[PDB]
Structure 1
Amino acid sequence: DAIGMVLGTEDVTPTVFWFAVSHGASVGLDDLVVVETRKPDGTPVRFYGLVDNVRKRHEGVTFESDVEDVVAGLLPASVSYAARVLVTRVDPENFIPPQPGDHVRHAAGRELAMALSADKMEEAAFPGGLLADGQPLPLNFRFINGESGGHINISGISGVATKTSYALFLLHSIFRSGVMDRTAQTAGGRALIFNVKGEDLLFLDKPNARMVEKEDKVVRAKGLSADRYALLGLPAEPFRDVQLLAPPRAAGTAIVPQTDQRSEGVTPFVFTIREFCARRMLPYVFSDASASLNLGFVIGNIEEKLFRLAAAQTGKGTGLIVHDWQFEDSETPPENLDFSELGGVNLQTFEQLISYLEYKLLEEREGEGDPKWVLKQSPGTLRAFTRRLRGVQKYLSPLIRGDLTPEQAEGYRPDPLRRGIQLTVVDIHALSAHAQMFVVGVLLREVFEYKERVGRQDTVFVVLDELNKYAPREGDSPIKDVLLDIAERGRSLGIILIGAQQTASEVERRIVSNAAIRVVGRLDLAEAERPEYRFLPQSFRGRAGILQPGTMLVSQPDVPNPVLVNYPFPAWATRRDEVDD
């Protein structure tokens, strides 16, 4: 149990000190070490630290050109192997230096738990990954579910850092470790995740045949005792209760999902015109936050009109029936127009709904429009609102249907909170950016409203990638607003964000600032020194530039510095090729 001796040739301070590695021992860059010293009074003090600097030097060589002779042993010299320890905790809080010559050892048992502040975690610790030699890393669940800490934020080079895989692992850990019941001691968990990568998120229902092979290879290499999942205490199995939703293909009443390689088990999801109006979906059409005009007054006004109009609807249908649409000279044709038994037009398509908005705002009274709808708003602002609806109508029109019947509508409505479902996967990769931002906006706002009305209830995890897309640093959008609501109010409300981006400096400062858990994959060279990565010490930056895929640094409030960690291969399928018959 001897790894080295505290060095006296370098200063020995309570925060930082060096030690010499014993012969036959190897000290890695991230190794967690404990050294115990004796006070003059005789009472002991334990120092728990992490190695941030490791070096090897030749102590007696006068010139670098004598190195060939020195290695041979012809010239007298001694190789010196030393490490620097960054103090994280002192069991007795005495800020006195350890004596040179004190024994340094790897934290392995109770010492390792003390170093990672597992005593503060208590029953709330659950596996956040693997340490150097198969020891699990305790993650304090109370800082994920909102008791004392907020959400999770993952950063790293997209394509190189494995951000989404680590998120899915954390969901697996949270769902299968039992910490939800332990911290509850309402005690359950749900997750909503969006497939935008192809069909990668679409087979996490099935076991991954390649997991065993790849697992055993790594197991034999690093010499772990059992399978990496077994070391964390987690079953190597897929997600138990999974729902796959997809958009409704492409003037046919029949509906079947846009998915190609996975066709079995996938359910189409659609919105109705009536629900569109009733549930104030209109703002989530305007996802261009990068820079724009102030349509807030127009959107709010038309939104309220549509809501009141939807509430007045007595019919059972899914479309919206309006009685004040006349076509003295509207390009729109009276044919193909569902007409009510009361002479009202029943809007069955999104393009018809925009046509009616054009009429109320721009054609109604020889061009000045219906004053109840245009509330003194300028013609230029109205037509901006109109033209943007026209621009996205083709892309949103298949997702919003009024021609569907009530049977189909109740069946196909996307509910991330459906009973008996733990993981909802919404397949948006076939949709355009406008349909993506629309669907994400509506669904997130639906979950937020529901938790506002009822309460914390079940803790709902939202796993979102490309955070810079949805919540830019400088823009302002509705979809960014619901993510702000989730970040700032989600702890108490029970909506927890597991978000990832290539760089946190491109994400809204209030989303990133509210993540209790920060996880860093391989970081770009320039990004590591940015202000948003101050929680990584300078020691880590050079290492972080070359971190291998699968390797993350996790930082959480309980323990002061980031800890490097690895995590197993997915027990679930992430592409079509990994599914047995």
Structure 2
Amino acid sequence: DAIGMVLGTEDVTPTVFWFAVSHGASVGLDDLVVVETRKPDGTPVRFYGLVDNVRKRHEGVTFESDVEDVVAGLLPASVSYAARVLVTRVDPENFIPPQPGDHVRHAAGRELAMALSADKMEEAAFPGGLLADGQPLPLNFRFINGESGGHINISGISGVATKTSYALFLLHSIFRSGVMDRTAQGSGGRQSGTAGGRALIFNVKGEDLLFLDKPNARMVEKEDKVVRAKGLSADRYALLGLPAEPFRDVQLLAPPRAGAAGTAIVPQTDQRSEGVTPFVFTIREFCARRMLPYVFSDASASLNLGFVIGNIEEKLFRLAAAQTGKGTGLIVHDWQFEDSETPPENLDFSELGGVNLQTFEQLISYLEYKLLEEREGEGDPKWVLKQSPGTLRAFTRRLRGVQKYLSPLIRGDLTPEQAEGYRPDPLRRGIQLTVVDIHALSAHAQMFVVGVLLREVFEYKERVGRQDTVFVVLDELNKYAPREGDSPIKDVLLDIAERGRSLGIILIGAQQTASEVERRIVSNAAIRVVGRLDLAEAERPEYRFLPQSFRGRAGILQPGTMLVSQPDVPNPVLVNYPFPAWATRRDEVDDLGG
């Protein structure tokens, strides 16, 4: 039943020590063990620890070429199988040394709970993945939902480290474990419900986050091989107390077909058209809800246009509040264009002689007249508050650059019912997971939609309060929150990281290297997960929470294998987690066989 004995040839310190592996037992690199030592007065002191180094030496072989004789039986040789243990816990916390010869044994039952501080987690423990020998690793939800700890940060080489798919596994674990229930017993209103929970996620890389609403045909065939190979009792999900089933209550939203002058509205998706709902903003919303700054996120040097943008934002806001009509466009009455080079065919003209702006192009043209033509090119003084003409043209030119890409999204030609039906609500009643398909959008349109949608949820939580947890799963954090660049979308993320704990917005974010992301986003994550990391980044300052033992291991980490670090447990523990039950590509949705 024991696994080894504490070695005496090496120093035995309370923090770290070596032990010799017993015959007939194997010790893997990441095994969790427990050793119990006796004090002089006879009181026990238990040491819970994790293996970080493992080796084998040949005892007494002398010259190396003796092996041929040695293994033939001619020369006597003993094999020395040794393991180093990094102590994570001392239950009576006497920092005394164990005695050499104390029995080392695998932490398997309550001993494992003590080894992973599961007593500190209490009911808030939920499946975080599988350990070496099929024992689920317990994550403390109180360090994920804001109660005691913030959000999560996942890192690793894209394509190899499985961060996005792991984040979806964490979502499945959180929704399917009842951990939101158990930890909603904490109080009646501080945080409450497992039904209340919601998740918002964006489909940046094209068509990969759709088919969460269809089961993965391939899961059992790939997962059978793992259960066959590692000799597990069952499929991993059942080991977790998790079901091997896809996401439920899923809302799929996509931009409207990039329709050029077409009133017909259909989503852009080629590979999936069923169950996909188009989402659009309206010109009047755009001005009423102050969406203008979220067009501006350059992730480069640029200038300080904050004055210009702030002024026109307020001008549009008061304009939209002045609108009395039910339409989705913005009616402006002060647009006269003798020779502002726009054509007169298509402008819908109001009953009161006003011009009704129906497309994003018109909204930008009207911004051009007020800023650069209102009075023979010097512009409307009330719109350009003495701002430089160059500064104006930059602003205008960046709006022009993205309007070809953003125009289908922001529509003033729609009628009021179409606008209320197509309006993007990541918090719609009865929906648990909302996927926003921004894959066909441009690098600018993408962060526009991400910007206002995150802001809309956050504004909603400020206004309403914090008894519903909303999960935002965001890949490529560096572009959204760059280390030195300053931007409005970054600002909303700064708001979710720093204030979202007590507001109820949890970020499960991922990036290839945390060193390219804003320090304040990475710093505010209680849970840090590491996939296969780059050999150069492992020694960076952002990954010191990995002991040196772990970087070399972290360079060859296999897909499906992650190192999670959570505040309760002072060491990274390695975990594997099942394949997605949810389809992650089109052919995994095969209703009828292959």
Q: Which bracket does the TM-score occupy, shorter chain normalised? A: over 0.9
Distance 2:68 2:455 in 1: 69
Cα deviation code 1:377-432 (max 9, x no counterpart): 11111111111111111011111110000010000011000000000000111111
Distance 1:99 1:229 in 2: 40
Cα deviation code 1:436-495 (max 9, x no counterpart): 011111100111101011111310000010111111111111111111111110100111
Distance 2:205 2:38 in 1: 57
* Residue 108 of structure 1 pairs with residue 116 of structure 2: no
| Alpha-carbon shift at residue 217 of structure 1 (Å) | 2.0
| Alpha-carbon shift at residue 187 of structure 1 (Å) | 5.9
* Residue 537 of structure 1 pairs with residue 536 of structure 2: no
Conservation of the 8 A alpha-carbon contact between 1:290 and 1:474: no
Distance 1:446 1:70 in 2: 73
| Alpha-carbon shift at residue 56 of structure 1 (Å) | 0.5
Cα deviation code 1:283-330 (max 9, x no counterpart): 010120221100000000000001110011000000000010000210
* Structure 1, gaps ≥5 residues long: none
| Alpha-carbon shift at residue 173 of structure 1 (Å) | 0.4
| Alpha-carbon shift at residue 69 of structure 1 (Å) | 2.8
State the secondary structure of the residue aligned to 1:202. Answer: coil
Distance 2:560 2:421 in 1: 40
| Alpha-carbon shift at residue 542 of structure 1 (Å) | 0.8
Distance 1:531 1:188 in 2: 38
State the secondary structure of the residue aligned to 1:554. Answer: strand
Cα deviation code 1:62-97 (max 9, x no counterpart): 233333333333333211100000010011010100
Distance 1:362 1:19 in 2: 79
Cα deviation code 1:185-242 (max 9, x no counterpart): x762100011122222100111111112222221122111122111100111111100
| Alpha-carbon shift at residue 529 of structure 1 (Å) | 0.3
| Alpha-carbon shift at residue 133 of structure 1 (Å) | 1.1
Aligned partner of 1:505 in structure 2 is 515
Distance 2:197 2:63 in 1: 64
169, 177, 193: which is aligned to 2:201?
193
Q: Sort the Cα spacing of 1:493 and 1:273 in 2 relative to 1 into closer, same or farther, 3 A.
A: same
Cα deviation code 1:533-580 (max 9, x no counterpart): 010000011111001000000000000000000111111111111123
Conservation of the 8 A alpha-carbon contact between 2:483 and 2:516: yes
The TM-score with structure 1 as length reference comes to 0.99
Cα deviation code 1:256-294 (max 9, x no counterpart): 100111110000111100011111110010120221100
| Alpha-carbon shift at residue 27 of structure 1 (Å) | 0.6
State the secondary structure of the residue aligned to 1:440. Answer: helix
State the secondary structure of the residue aligned to 1:356. Answer: helix
Conservation of the 8 A alpha-carbon contact between 1:156 and 1:503: yes
Cα deviation code 1:470-522 (max 9, x no counterpart): 11111111111111111110100111100001110110000000000000000
Distance 2:72 2:254 in 1: 68
Conservation of the 8 A alpha-carbon contact between 1:181 and 1:188: no
Distance 1:291 1:470 in 2: 15
Conservation of the 8 A alpha-carbon contact between 1:516 and 1:556: yes
Conservation of the 8 A alpha-carbon contact between 2:154 and 2:528: yes
Distance 2:526 2:353 in 1: 58
Aligned partner of 1:246 in structure 2 is 254
Conservation of the 8 A alpha-carbon contact between 1:180 and 1:188: no
Distance 1:323 1:190 in 2: 43
Distance 1:129 1:543 in 2: 18
Conservation of the 8 A alpha-carbon contact between 1:471 and 1:479: yes
State the secondary structure of the residue aligned to 1:139. Answer: strand
Conservation of the 8 A alpha-carbon contact between 1:208 and 1:579: yes
State the secondary structure of the residue aligned to 1:505. Answer: helix
Cα deviation code 1:129-151 (max 9, x no counterpart): 00111101100000000001011
More displaced stretch, 281-290 vs 504-513? 281-290
Distance 2:339 2:215 in 1: 60
Distance 1:477 1:234 in 2: 40
Distance 2:507 2:67 in 1: 55
Distance 2:487 2:68 in 1: 65
Conservation of the 8 A alpha-carbon contact between 2:299 and 2:479: no
Distance 2:264 2:424 in 1: 18
Distance 1:359 1:68 in 2: 91
Distance 1:5 1:486 in 2: 49
Distance 1:328 1:276 in 2: 27
Conservation of the 8 A alpha-carbon contact between 1:131 and 1:564: yes
| Alpha-carbon shift at residue 163 of structure 1 (Å) | 0.8
More displaced stretch, 352-361 vs 250-259? 250-259
State the secondary structure of the residue aligned to 1:200. Answer: coil
The TM-score with structure 2 as length reference comes to 0.96
State the secondary structure of the residue aligned to 1:104. Answer: strand
Conservation of the 8 A alpha-carbon contact between 1:257 and 1:267: yes
| Alpha-carbon shift at residue 334 of structure 1 (Å) | 1.9
Distance 1:473 1:497 in 2: 17
Distance 2:384 2:479 in 1: 32
State the secondary structure of the residue aligned to 1:70. Answer: helix
* Residue 436 of structure 1 pairs with residue 446 of structure 2: yes
State the secondary structure of the residue aligned to 2:183. Answer: helix
More displaced stretch, 408-417 vs 199-208? 199-208
Distance 1:561 1:71 in 2: 39
Aligned partner of 2:20 in structure 1 is 20
Distance 2:377 2:441 in 1: 35
Conservation of the 8 A alpha-carbon contact between 2:330 and 2:356: yes
* Residue 330 of structure 1 pairs with residue 343 of structure 2: no
Distance 1:508 1:542 in 2: 26
Cα deviation code 1:335-376 (max 9, x no counterpart): 200111001000000010010011111101122222211112
Distance 1:75 1:301 in 2: 89
Across the aligned residues of Structure 1 and Structure 2, the Cα RMSD in angstroms comes to: 1.0
State the secondary structure of the residue aligned to 1:529. Answer: coil
Cα deviation code 1:112-167 (max 9, x no counterpart): 00000000000100000001111011000000000010111100110111111100
State the secondary structure of the residue aligned to 1:517. Answer: strand
